[PDB]
Design a protein around this ligand. Structure first.
Ligand code: AP5
Length: 214
Protein backbone atom coordinates (compact mmCIF):
# COMPACT_ATOMS: atom_id res chain seq x y z
CA UNK A 1 0.00 0.00 0.00
CA UNK A 2 1.26 3.46 -0.98
CA UNK A 3 0.16 6.74 0.59
CA UNK A 4 0.73 10.50 0.31
CA UNK A 5 -0.12 12.93 3.12
CA UNK A 6 -1.28 16.43 2.13
CA UNK A 7 -1.74 19.47 4.36
CA UNK A 8 -0.45 22.78 5.69
CA UNK A 9 2.49 22.91 8.12
CA UNK A 10 1.56 21.58 11.56
CA UNK A 11 -1.61 19.93 10.28
CA UNK A 12 -0.62 16.69 12.03
CA UNK A 13 0.75 14.67 9.11
CA UNK A 14 3.90 13.41 10.81
CA UNK A 15 1.95 12.62 13.96
CA UNK A 16 -0.56 10.42 12.13
CA UNK A 17 2.10 8.91 9.88
CA UNK A 18 3.49 7.08 12.92
CA UNK A 19 0.28 5.09 13.32
CA UNK A 20 -0.03 4.17 9.63
CA UNK A 21 3.59 3.01 9.49
CA UNK A 22 3.24 0.67 12.47
CA UNK A 23 -0.13 -0.71 11.37
CA UNK A 24 0.69 -1.35 7.71
CA UNK A 25 4.39 -2.15 8.01
CA UNK A 26 5.35 0.51 5.50
CA UNK A 27 8.12 3.09 6.10
CA UNK A 28 7.42 6.79 6.59
CA UNK A 29 9.27 8.86 3.99
CA UNK A 30 9.67 12.32 5.52
CA UNK A 31 11.59 14.85 3.43
CA UNK A 32 11.71 17.16 6.45
CA UNK A 33 13.35 14.47 8.57
CA UNK A 34 15.89 13.64 5.86
CA UNK A 35 16.85 17.27 5.26
CA UNK A 36 17.37 17.85 8.98
CA UNK A 37 19.44 14.67 9.30
CA UNK A 38 21.54 15.62 6.27
CA UNK A 39 22.30 18.98 7.87
CA UNK A 40 23.04 17.19 11.14
CA UNK A 41 25.47 14.61 9.72
CA UNK A 42 26.70 16.80 6.87
CA UNK A 43 25.59 14.37 4.17
CA UNK A 44 26.69 15.40 0.67
CA UNK A 45 23.09 15.29 -0.56
CA UNK A 46 21.10 17.61 1.71
CA UNK A 47 23.85 19.36 3.68
CA UNK A 48 22.98 22.57 1.84
CA UNK A 49 19.48 22.61 3.33
CA UNK A 50 20.38 24.40 6.58
CA UNK A 51 19.93 28.08 5.66
CA UNK A 52 16.86 27.48 3.49
CA UNK A 53 14.85 25.76 6.22
CA UNK A 54 15.98 28.52 8.58
CA UNK A 55 14.37 31.17 6.39
CA UNK A 56 11.14 29.18 6.24
CA UNK A 57 11.73 28.68 2.52
CA UNK A 58 11.28 25.53 0.45
CA UNK A 59 14.35 23.59 -0.68
CA UNK A 60 14.94 23.14 -4.44
CA UNK A 61 12.85 20.60 -6.35
CA UNK A 62 15.93 18.77 -7.62
CA UNK A 63 17.56 18.30 -4.22
CA UNK A 64 14.45 16.80 -2.61
CA UNK A 65 13.57 14.67 -5.65
CA UNK A 66 17.05 13.14 -5.45
CA UNK A 67 16.65 12.49 -1.72
CA UNK A 68 13.32 10.77 -2.27
CA UNK A 69 14.38 8.61 -5.21
CA UNK A 70 17.49 7.56 -3.28
CA UNK A 71 15.50 6.81 -0.12
CA UNK A 72 12.63 5.13 -1.97
CA UNK A 73 14.86 2.65 -3.81
CA UNK A 74 15.61 1.22 -0.37
CA UNK A 75 14.51 -2.37 0.25
CA UNK A 76 12.12 -1.44 3.07
CA UNK A 77 9.92 0.21 0.41
CA UNK A 78 9.20 -3.07 -1.41
CA UNK A 79 5.66 -3.51 -0.12
CA UNK A 80 4.73 0.16 -0.06
CA UNK A 81 5.61 3.40 1.69
CA UNK A 82 4.11 6.60 3.08
CA UNK A 83 5.17 9.94 1.59
CA UNK A 84 5.14 12.70 4.20
CA UNK A 85 6.28 16.11 2.95
CA UNK A 86 6.67 14.97 -0.65
CA UNK A 87 5.52 16.05 -3.12
CA UNK A 88 5.68 19.68 -1.97
CA UNK A 89 5.39 21.33 -5.38
CA UNK A 90 3.72 20.56 -8.71
CA UNK A 91 7.01 19.77 -10.47
CA UNK A 92 7.80 17.39 -7.60
CA UNK A 93 4.49 15.61 -8.19
CA UNK A 94 5.04 15.45 -11.94
CA UNK A 95 8.58 14.12 -11.50
CA UNK A 96 7.11 11.23 -9.51
CA UNK A 97 4.26 10.62 -11.96
CA UNK A 98 6.45 10.27 -15.04
CA UNK A 99 8.84 8.00 -13.14
CA UNK A 100 5.88 5.63 -13.07
CA UNK A 101 5.14 5.92 -9.36
CA UNK A 102 1.42 5.68 -8.58
CA UNK A 103 -0.07 5.61 -5.08
CA UNK A 104 -3.25 4.09 -3.64
CA UNK A 105 -4.24 6.86 -1.24
CA UNK A 106 -3.83 10.61 -1.08
CA UNK A 107 -4.85 11.88 2.35
CA UNK A 108 -5.55 15.57 2.92
CA UNK A 109 -5.51 17.08 6.42
CA UNK A 110 -7.88 20.03 6.85
CA UNK A 111 -6.65 22.55 9.43
CA UNK A 112 -7.35 26.31 9.80
CA UNK A 113 -4.42 28.74 9.59
CA UNK A 114 -5.15 30.20 13.03
CA UNK A 115 -4.21 26.91 14.73
CA UNK A 116 -0.81 26.46 13.12
CA UNK A 117 1.44 28.84 15.08
CA UNK A 118 0.50 27.66 18.59
CA UNK A 119 0.92 24.09 17.38
CA UNK A 120 4.43 24.63 16.03
CA UNK A 121 5.71 26.68 18.97
CA UNK A 122 4.80 23.83 21.32
CA UNK A 123 6.31 21.12 19.12
CA UNK A 124 9.06 18.92 20.56
CA UNK A 125 10.72 16.16 18.54
CA UNK A 126 12.86 13.06 18.89
CA UNK A 127 15.41 13.80 16.15
CA UNK A 128 16.75 10.24 15.66
CA UNK A 129 13.28 8.86 14.82
CA UNK A 130 11.25 11.88 13.76
CA UNK A 131 8.65 11.27 16.46
CA UNK A 132 6.80 14.46 17.38
CA UNK A 133 5.07 15.73 20.52
CA UNK A 134 3.28 18.83 21.79
CA UNK A 135 3.86 20.25 25.27
CA UNK A 136 0.14 20.96 25.70
CA UNK A 137 -1.85 19.18 22.97
CA UNK A 138 0.02 15.87 22.77
CA UNK A 139 2.65 15.50 25.53
CA UNK A 140 5.11 12.60 26.01
CA UNK A 141 4.42 10.12 28.81
CA UNK A 142 7.30 11.72 30.70
CA UNK A 143 8.01 15.43 30.22
CA UNK A 144 10.77 16.14 27.71
CA UNK A 145 11.43 12.46 26.99
CA UNK A 146 10.68 10.35 23.92
CA UNK A 147 8.11 7.65 24.73
CA UNK A 148 9.98 4.91 22.89
CA UNK A 149 13.64 5.50 23.82
CA UNK A 150 13.30 7.89 26.76
CA UNK A 151 15.87 10.16 25.12
CA UNK A 152 15.67 13.94 25.54
CA UNK A 153 13.35 15.73 23.13
CA UNK A 154 14.48 18.90 21.37
CA UNK A 155 12.85 21.88 19.67
CA UNK A 156 13.38 22.48 15.96
CA UNK A 157 15.39 25.59 15.10
CA UNK A 158 12.75 26.68 12.58
CA UNK A 159 9.73 26.33 14.88
CA UNK A 160 9.49 30.00 15.84
CA UNK A 161 6.38 32.06 15.09
CA UNK A 162 7.99 34.27 12.43
CA UNK A 163 9.47 31.27 10.62
CA UNK A 164 6.12 29.49 10.79
CA UNK A 165 4.37 32.44 9.16
CA UNK A 166 6.77 32.13 6.23
CA UNK A 167 6.20 28.40 5.74
CA UNK A 168 2.47 29.10 5.64
CA UNK A 169 2.89 31.68 2.88
CA UNK A 170 5.03 29.21 0.93
CA UNK A 171 2.46 26.43 1.36
CA UNK A 172 -0.57 28.33 0.08
CA UNK A 173 1.50 29.47 -2.89
CA UNK A 174 3.52 26.37 -3.79
CA UNK A 175 1.86 23.37 -2.16
CA UNK A 176 -1.90 23.98 -1.98
CA UNK A 177 -2.29 23.29 -5.73
CA UNK A 178 -1.41 19.64 -5.04
CA UNK A 179 -4.92 19.13 -3.68
CA UNK A 180 -6.41 19.75 -7.11
CA UNK A 181 -3.58 17.82 -8.73
CA UNK A 182 -4.44 14.61 -6.88
CA UNK A 183 -8.19 15.18 -6.85
CA UNK A 184 -7.73 15.10 -10.63
CA UNK A 185 -5.61 11.96 -10.35
CA UNK A 186 -8.32 10.38 -8.21
CA UNK A 187 -10.99 11.16 -10.80
CA UNK A 188 -8.82 9.50 -13.45
CA UNK A 189 -9.03 6.31 -11.40
CA UNK A 190 -5.31 6.52 -10.67
CA UNK A 191 -5.77 6.81 -6.91
CA UNK A 192 -8.21 7.33 -4.07
CA UNK A 193 -8.50 10.76 -2.45
CA UNK A 194 -9.80 11.70 1.00
CA UNK A 195 -9.87 14.65 3.40
CA UNK A 196 -10.01 14.52 7.20
CA UNK A 197 -10.73 17.10 9.90
CA UNK A 198 -7.28 17.67 11.34
CA UNK A 199 -8.65 19.59 14.32
CA UNK A 200 -10.00 16.45 15.99
CA UNK A 201 -8.03 14.90 18.86
CA UNK A 202 -5.10 12.75 17.69
CA UNK A 203 -6.94 9.54 18.56
CA UNK A 204 -9.98 10.51 16.48
CA UNK A 205 -8.08 11.54 13.35
CA UNK A 206 -6.22 8.23 13.61
CA UNK A 207 -9.58 6.46 13.74
CA UNK A 208 -10.85 8.41 10.73
CA UNK A 209 -7.76 7.58 8.69
CA UNK A 210 -8.09 3.92 9.64
CA UNK A 211 -11.68 3.86 8.39
CA UNK A 212 -10.31 5.01 5.03
CA UNK A 213 -7.28 2.70 4.86
CA UNK A 214 -8.38 -0.44 6.70
N1 AP5 B 1 9.26 17.93 -0.27
C1 AP5 B 1 10.01 19.13 0.06
N2 AP5 B 1 10.39 19.96 -0.92
C2 AP5 B 1 11.14 21.14 -0.62
N3 AP5 B 1 11.46 21.42 0.67
C3 AP5 B 1 11.07 20.55 1.71
C4 AP5 B 1 10.35 19.43 1.42
N4 AP5 B 1 10.09 18.75 2.65
C5 AP5 B 1 10.68 19.52 3.72
N5 AP5 B 1 11.27 20.60 3.18
C6 AP5 B 1 12.04 21.62 3.93
O1 AP5 B 1 12.04 21.35 5.34
C7 AP5 B 1 11.13 22.34 6.00
C8 AP5 B 1 10.13 21.82 7.07
O2 AP5 B 1 9.10 20.98 6.61
P1 AP5 B 1 8.47 19.89 7.68
O3 AP5 B 1 9.71 18.96 8.19
O4 AP5 B 1 7.44 19.08 7.03
O5 AP5 B 1 7.83 20.69 8.99
P2 AP5 B 1 6.67 21.88 8.80
O6 AP5 B 1 6.77 22.65 7.34
O7 AP5 B 1 6.79 22.88 9.85
O8 AP5 B 1 5.19 21.18 8.95
P3 AP5 B 1 5.05 19.54 9.14
O9 AP5 B 1 4.75 18.88 7.87
O10 AP5 B 1 6.43 18.90 9.82
O11 AP5 B 1 3.75 19.42 10.17
P4 AP5 B 1 2.87 18.05 10.37
O12 AP5 B 1 1.71 17.92 9.21
O13 AP5 B 1 3.74 16.88 10.35
O14 AP5 B 1 2.15 18.26 11.85
P5 AP5 B 1 2.81 17.55 13.21
O15 AP5 B 1 2.54 15.93 13.16
O16 AP5 B 1 4.24 17.84 13.32
O17 AP5 B 1 2.07 18.25 14.51
C9 AP5 B 1 2.21 19.63 14.71
C10 AP5 B 1 2.15 20.01 16.19
O18 AP5 B 1 0.82 20.00 16.80
C11 AP5 B 1 0.66 18.79 17.54
N6 AP5 B 1 -0.47 17.98 16.98
C12 AP5 B 1 -0.40 16.95 16.08
N7 AP5 B 1 -1.77 16.45 15.86
C13 AP5 B 1 -2.65 17.21 16.65
C14 AP5 B 1 -4.03 17.18 16.82
N8 AP5 B 1 -4.86 16.21 16.10
N9 AP5 B 1 -4.60 18.02 17.63
C15 AP5 B 1 -3.80 19.02 18.36
N10 AP5 B 1 -2.48 19.05 18.20
C16 AP5 B 1 -1.88 18.16 17.35
C17 AP5 B 1 1.98 18.01 17.54
O19 AP5 B 1 2.28 17.18 18.62
C18 AP5 B 1 2.98 19.14 17.15
O20 AP5 B 1 3.70 19.78 18.18
C19 AP5 B 1 10.53 23.17 4.78
O21 AP5 B 1 10.00 24.44 5.07
C20 AP5 B 1 11.63 23.05 3.74
O22 AP5 B 1 12.66 24.03 3.75
Amino acid sequence: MRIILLGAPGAGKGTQAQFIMEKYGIPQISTGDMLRAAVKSGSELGKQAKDIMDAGKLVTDELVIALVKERIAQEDCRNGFLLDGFPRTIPQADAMKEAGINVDYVLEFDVPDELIVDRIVGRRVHAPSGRVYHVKFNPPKVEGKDDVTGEELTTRKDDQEETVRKRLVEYHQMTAPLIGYYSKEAEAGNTKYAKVDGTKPVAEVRADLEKILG
